[PDB]
Design a protein around this ligand. Structure first.
Ligand code: LOC
Ligand code: NA
Length: 128
């Protein structure tokens, strides 16, 4: 009777949202996102959590601000962001969602931690 569904994905396109192309946002796409996207642990993070497919009916009860690298990649390619901080916040939301939903010893958490370490190493060099 009652089907579980996924929420609409986060907005990747809004012509009326203020947006800029900055050196920092270019670095976030060409260096930061590119590095994490190709990482051996990227696969769970390359698209919204599909709670229907993965049989996680509780995921979107716990995680109220979903984020993932597929969304971030589209945002960067679509010039969705006003500043680097908005994009950094999306990465932080993605990692934090994983830590919140799962338990500290879990494989998925180990994966997120490795991606986060690389992320922090790259944003240490954010230009400007
Ligand atoms: C049945 O197979 C899978 C099922 C899930 C996940 C997953 O990717 C590792 C799977 O492998 C395809 C899974 C995926 C993504 C998550 O966040 C990105 C998450 O928090 C959490 C998960 C999963 N939880 C854990 C502790 O790995 C639950 C659902
Ligand atoms: Na947790």
């Amino acid at each position: 009777h009652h089907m579980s569904t996924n929420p609409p994905p986060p907005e990747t396109s809004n012509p009326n949202k203020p947006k800029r192309q900055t050196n920092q946002l270019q670095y976030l796409l060409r260096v930061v996102l590119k590095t994490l996207w190709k990482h051996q642990f990227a696969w769970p993070f390359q698209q919204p959590v599909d709670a229907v497919k993965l049989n996680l009916p509780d995921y979107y009860k716990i995680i109220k601000t979903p984020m993932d690298m597929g969304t971030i990649k589209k945002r960067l390619e679509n010039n969705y962001y006003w500043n680097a901080q908005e994009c950094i916040q999306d990465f932080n939301t993605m990692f934090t969602n994983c830590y919140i939903y799962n338990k500290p010893g879990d494989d998925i958490v180990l994966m997120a931690e490795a991606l986060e370490k690389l992320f922090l190493q790259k944003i240490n060099e954010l230009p400007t």
